[PDB]
Design a protein around this ligand. Structure first.
Ligand SMILES: CN(C(=O)Cn1cc(Br)cn1)C1CC1
Ligand SMILES: [Cl-]
Length: 115
């Protein structure tokens, strides 16, 4: 069901190496609904190429637009398993400190802060 489950470490690593060659200015992000989540819908896709200059605040807005949420729905985004310390960091900076060993940046979203 989950991405890491669907693809071998060898396949996830090769996918990241190709995004580097074909989309060198993009951050390879896996965005996944929390396996618990009741309220928010699932995304149309799993794998996003994020322009490496957007900060985490703009990425939340993108995903809320993608889910077509409205003003008073709540949305929480974990990066690499934990809360974001700051939303003003450029995703290029976040990638270098929070990327997995396969080379993707893993994110999970839910409606409560208690995932
Ligand atoms: C970039 N972006 C997307 O819609 C995902 N995407 C674009 C290509 Br090209 C492939 N995937 C949003 C998250 C910032
Ligand atoms: Cl590019």
């Amino acid at each position: 069901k989950t991405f890491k489950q669907r693809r071998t470490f060898e396949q996830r690593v090769e996918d990241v190496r190709l995004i580097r060659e074909q989309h060198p200015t993009k951050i390879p992000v896996i965005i996944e609904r929390y396996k618990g989540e009741k309220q928010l819908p699932v995304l149309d896709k799993t794998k996003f190429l994020v322009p490496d200059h957007v900060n985490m605040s703009e990425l939340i807005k993108i995903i809320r637009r993608r889910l077509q949420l409205n003003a008073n729905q709540a949305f929480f985004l974990l990066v690499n398993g934990h809360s974001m310390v700051s939303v003003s960091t450029p995703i290029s900076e976040v990638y270098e400190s929070e990327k997995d060993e396969d080379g993707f940046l893993y994110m999970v979203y839910a409606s409560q802060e208690t995932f």
